Amino acid sequence: QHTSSMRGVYYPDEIFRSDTLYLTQDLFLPFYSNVTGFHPVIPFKDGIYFAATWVFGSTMNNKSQSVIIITNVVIRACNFELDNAFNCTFEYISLREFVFKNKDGFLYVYKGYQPLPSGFNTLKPIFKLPLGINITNFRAILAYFVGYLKPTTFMLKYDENGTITDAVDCSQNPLAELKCSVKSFEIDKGIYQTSNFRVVPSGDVVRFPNITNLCPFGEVFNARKKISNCVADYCYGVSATKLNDLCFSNVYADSFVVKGDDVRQIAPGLPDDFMGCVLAWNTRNKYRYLRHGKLRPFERLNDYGFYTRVVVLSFELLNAPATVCGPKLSTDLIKNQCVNFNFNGLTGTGVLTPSSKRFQPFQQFGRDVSDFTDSVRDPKTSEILDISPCSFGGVSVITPGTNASSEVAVLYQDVNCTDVSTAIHADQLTPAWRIYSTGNNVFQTQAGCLIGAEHVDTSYECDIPIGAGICASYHTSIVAYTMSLGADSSIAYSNNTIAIPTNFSISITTEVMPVSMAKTSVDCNMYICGDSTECANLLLQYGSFCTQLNRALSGIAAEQDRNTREVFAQVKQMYKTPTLKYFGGFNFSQILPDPLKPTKRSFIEDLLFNKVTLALICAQKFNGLTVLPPLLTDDMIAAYTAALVSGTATAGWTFGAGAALQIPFAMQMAYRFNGIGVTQNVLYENQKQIANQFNKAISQIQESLTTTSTALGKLQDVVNQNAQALNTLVKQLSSNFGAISSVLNDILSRLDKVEAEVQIDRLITGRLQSLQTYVTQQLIRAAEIRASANLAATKMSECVLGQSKRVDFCGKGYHLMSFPQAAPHGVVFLHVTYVPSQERNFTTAPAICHEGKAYFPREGVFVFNGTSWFITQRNFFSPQIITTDNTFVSGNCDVVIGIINNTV
Amino acid sequence: DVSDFTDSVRDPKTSEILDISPCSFGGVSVITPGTNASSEVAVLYQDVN
Ligand SMILES: *[C@@H]1O[C@H](CO)[C@@H](O)[C@H](O)[C@H]1NC(C)=O
Numbered sequence: 001q002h003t004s005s006m007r008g009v010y011y012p013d014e015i016f017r018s019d020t021l022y023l024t025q026d027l028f029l030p031f032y033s034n035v036t037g038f039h040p041v042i043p044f045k046d047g048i049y050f051a052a053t054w055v056f057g058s059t060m061n062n063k064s065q066s067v068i069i070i071t072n073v074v075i076r077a078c079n080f081e082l083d084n085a086f087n088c089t090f091e092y093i094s095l096r097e098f099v100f101k102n103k104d105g106f107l108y109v110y111k112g113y114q115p116l117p118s119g120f121n122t123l124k125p126i127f128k129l130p131l132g133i134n135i136t137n138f139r140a141i142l143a144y145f146v147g148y149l150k151p152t153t154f155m156l157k158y159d160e161n162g163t164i165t166d167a168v169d170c171s172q173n174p175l176a177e178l179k180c181s182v183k184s185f186e187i188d189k190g191i192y193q194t195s196n197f198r199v200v201p202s203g204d205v206v207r208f209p210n211i212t213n214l215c216p217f218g219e220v221f222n223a224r225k226k227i228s229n230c231v232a233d234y235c236y237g238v239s240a241t242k243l244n245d246l247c248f249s250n251v252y253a254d255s256f257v258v259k260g261d262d263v264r265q266i267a268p269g270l271p272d273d274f275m276g277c278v279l280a281w282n283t284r285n286k287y288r289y290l291r292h293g294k295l296r297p298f299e300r301l302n303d304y305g306f307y308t309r310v311v312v313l314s315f316e317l318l319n320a321p322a323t324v325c326g327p328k329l330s331t332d333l334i335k336n337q338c339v340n341f342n343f344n345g346l347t348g349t350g351v352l353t354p355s356s357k358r359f360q361p362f363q364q365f366g367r368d369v370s371d372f373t374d375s376v377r378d379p380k381t382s383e384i385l386d387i388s389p390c391s392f393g394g395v396s397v398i399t400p401g402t403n404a405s406s407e408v409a410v411l412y413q414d415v416n417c418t419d420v421s422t423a424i425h426a427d428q429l430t431p432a433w434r435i436y437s438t439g440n441n442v443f444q445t446q447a448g449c450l451i452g453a454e455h456v457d458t459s460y461e462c463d464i465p466i467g468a469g470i471c472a473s474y475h476t477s478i479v480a481y482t483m484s485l486g487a488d489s490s491i492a493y494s495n496n497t498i499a500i501p502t503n504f505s506i507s508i509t510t511e512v513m514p515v516s517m518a519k520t521s522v523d524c525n526m527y528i529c530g531d532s533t534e535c536a537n538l539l540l541q542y543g544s545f546c547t548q549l550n551r552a553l554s555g556i557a558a559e560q561d562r563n564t565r566e567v568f569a570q571v572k573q574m575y576k577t578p579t580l581k582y583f584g585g586f587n588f589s590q591i592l593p594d595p596l597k598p599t600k601r602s603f604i605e606d607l608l609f610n611k612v613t614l615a616l617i618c619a620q621k622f623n624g625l626t627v628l629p630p631l632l633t634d635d636m637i638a639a640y641t642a643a644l645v646s647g648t649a650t651a652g653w654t655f656g657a658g659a660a661l662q663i664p665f666a667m668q669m670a671y672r673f674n675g676i677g678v679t680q681n682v683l684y685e686n687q688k689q690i691a692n693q694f695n696k697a698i699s700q701i702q703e704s705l706t707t708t709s710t711a712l713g714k715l716q717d718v719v720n721q722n723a724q725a726l727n728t729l730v731k732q733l734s735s736n737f738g739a740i741s742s743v744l745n746d747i748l749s750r751l752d753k754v755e756a757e758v759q760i761d762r763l764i765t766g767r768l769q770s771l772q773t774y775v776t777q778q779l780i781r782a783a784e785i786r787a788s789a790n791l792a793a794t795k796m797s798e799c800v801l802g803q804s805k806r807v808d809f810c811g812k813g814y815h816l817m818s819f820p821q822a823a824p825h826g827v828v829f830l831h832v833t834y835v836p837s838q839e840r841n842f843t844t845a846p847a848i849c850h851e852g853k854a855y856f857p858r859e860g861v862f863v864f865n866g867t868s869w870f871i872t873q874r875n876f877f878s879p880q881i882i883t884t885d886n887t888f889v890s891g892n893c894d895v896v897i898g899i900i901n902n903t904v
Numbered sequence: 905d906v907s908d909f910t911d912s913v914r915d916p917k918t919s920e921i922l923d924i925s926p927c928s929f930g931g932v933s934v935i936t937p938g939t940n941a942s943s944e945v946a947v948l949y950q951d952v953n
Pocket residue numbers: 001002003032033034035
């Protein structure tokens with residue numbers, strides 16, 4: 001008894017594929033399965049996998065056709081006695097692994113070779129024998145290992161040469177299904193939703209009226225009559241073969257004598273909404289053709305003159321208690337377990353329990369507020385409600401990313417979480433992993449079971465989100481905890497204490513915005529209804545949908561160019577680079593293009609293009625999909641941002657409104673300090689320190705971009721969303737929406753010109769719907785991008801071309817400056833802000849009065865220091881002597897505290 | 905191919921020739937001064953060699 005690690009993979013067809021992932025369903029050998037060694041007849045069971053380092057039959061006797069295989073190969077399907085060569089029809093004369101498969105009479109044979117150990121090797125087809133026999137047993141002919149094939153889906157990987165170089169079993173692990181669902185081998189960290197789940201039924205329940213009798217169903221035919229309280233044995237609304245499983249009430253038979261000349265007059269065109277069964281029979285071995293007006297259905301002169309019947313059965317159902325129906329062995333009642341229903345006329349599935357609903361005596365069924373059957377009356381007069389189909393929901397897999405581990409936890413969304421545990425170990429769940437264990441269960445507050453994660457008591461910053469307040473993470477086996485909102489802090493409030501900063505720092509932070517998206521086009525008549533005319537004529541009937549679709553996509557494309565134009569083309573003149581790149585003590589390189597390099601992009605703007613990944617020639621595909629080019633090249637968009645930075649460096653604020661006015665860039669930074677409420681002396685006395693902080697902040701940005709993981713996250717999301725929408729549209733062309741084939745020229749080549757028009761219509765309607773869905777969702781996406789481009793144009797005017805007082809609009813501090821940089825399908829702002837720090841404590845008063853005259857500070861607050869009172873600004877400590885020019889007087893000090901002999 | 909188009913065939917008489925290229929198709933657009941200045945126009949055949 002050994003294990004088959006990854007053995008038994010073969011090419012499923014004879015079609016060449018290269019560099020792709022292909023999902024298929026067929027009989028395969030599950031990974032890490034049980035393989036029975038041999039160091040003896042063996043059952044077949046719909047296929048086997050055979051190795052070694054054959055005779056096929058049904059009874060291994062003379063009464064059952066058998067087969068024998070054997071570089072001279074002899075395949076002879078004859079009743080060889082186990083001297084017998086009779087009763088046979090087929091003859092054929094011309095680490096090793098073999099696969100055997102019996103289907104539709106043919107017996108397929110695959111074979112491989114390699115000079116059970118570990119590894120995987122791929123087999124190829126050899127024979128396909130139309131034996132057409134029944135194979136259940138076999139025996140070897142003389143260290144051979146036997147597997148078994150089961151219906152499973154695999155994901156097979158091809159390479160450039162078209163060789164199967166890997167596979168995945170999509171029913172082995174939760175991770176294996178996750179890989180199979182997203183169609184990849186490496187998976188990022190996160191939580192993904194996958195196939196649903198549902199508890200499988202547990203039993204069969206039947207309840208029929210206990211009345212038993214022999215029915216006159218036969219007497220009436222050979223001789224309007226009613227039949228009731230019998231058991232018949234045995235079409236316009238029912239199938240004859242399906243009549244012996246439904247229970248009716250008072251089946252009626254209409255009988256009369258008419259020759260075959262009038263049988264073709266009894267049918268609708270008999271009510272129009274009613275059903276029934278009609279029989280007729282002739283043997284030859286009155287009527288009215290005059291009446292004023294016709295008759296309503298089911299209501300009641302010459303002679304036919306017979307010379308040498310029609311029974312219209314009517315069925316009434318689900319109205320009164322069931323009394324007429326065929327043989328059905330009853331069953332006992334089971335409650336509180338997902339079972340099957342076969343009540344009088346209600347076949348379903350669910351959970352039963354006693355009810356508390358006051359049925360009226362003349363009622364037998366129940367209904368909800370939405371017309372669902374949430375109650376029933378047992379044929380033995382009992383009210384039991386069949387609430388819900390036991391259980392179902394969704395399944396989500398939590399993974400750290402497959403780059404750090406292969407351990408995952410599984411969440412079941414909406415379950416009491418005790419039913420799941422019972423079904424897992426009872427083998428009662430449709431998602432059936434071959435290798436999966438349960439060690440511990442946590443019940444999320446409202447998100448259901450969590451299996452594979454251990455609860456911890458501490459709290460962290462919610463790596464992966466789950467449920468309501470409960471998140472999960474790997475480093476913190478994976479652990480599930482409760483969210484932590486932040487750091488608890490306290491402040492001692494008082495009435496005569498204030499805090500004033502005594503130092504600051506320069507901070508530069510980045511901001512990423514998308515402004516545009518891909519500009520695609522379609523060829524309506526080529527995507528649908530390809531290079532053909534029989535189909536092209538059929539598509540003219542659907543009005544002019546193609547013209548509508550082309551107009552909508554042309555509107556989106558022309559809008560993307562307005563987006564980029566509105567954000568960047570905000571300068572009237574193209575200022576040349578100052579060819580100095582050192583102002584005051586500020587280093588402006590790495591944001592201005594280098595003149596000694598080929599590409600005219602700044603250093604920081606070159607790292608942004610190496611972060612986002614997308615994966616004349618003039619290539620074209622068969623599907624009619626294409627992407628148009630932008631109007632502004634990447635070298636023109638980069639010339640706009642270099643002009644904007646050059647204008648800010650020299651001439652500062654006043655470019656745009658008016659004409660650019662020079663300024664040495666050290667005088668304006670002083671002016672930018674007055675905006676945030678700090679005097680000029682602060683800059684001019686600490687210019688060297690401030691310049692150092694500026695240069696360091698830029699360097700950290702450059703280093704971070706080089707060695708980060710995801711800062712251009714929003715720009716990548718736009719690329720992924722557009723590629724996912726096109727891939728869905730392309731893969732919808734390999735789908736047959738009801739026709740026998742999904743490719744034209746395969747039904748257009750085998751046609752009758754009467755039957756091929758119905759399948760072509762099936763594809764046309766299916767492909768038109770998929771096109772409309774693509775256009776609708778692109779219109780919604782394009783409106784969301786327009787919102788982000790409108791905001792980016794506001795930030796260019798208010799953060800780059802000026803100074804902003806709106807709180808936290810540009811940056812996070814006080815917004816000295818801001819520089820733009822170009823990114824693929826986006827823009828990056830670098831906000832330079834001012835951050836005070838190093839608080840101190842002081843004593844303060846509202847006002848000061850000298851000689852009965854109060855003195856309020858014209859601008860600032862009063863402080864005490866430790867020796868004498870002073871007046872200072874709020875954002876920086878710079879005490880000043882209290883004089884008559886800092887203060888002003890208003891009234892007498894009767895409600896304002898404090899006094900000192902320091903004024904004037 | 906992915907969309908169940910052949911895109912490549914084997915010559916019965918010992919060769920393999922690419923069916924991929926579906927020759928040329930696209931959309932045409934007309935550039936006009938506006939039937940007022942003049943009546944001469946230019947045509948753009950999009951995505952062709
Ligand atoms: C192979 O059979 C043995 C014996 O029952 C069993 O313990 C083992 O789990 C089987 N292999 C696998 C992969 O399940």
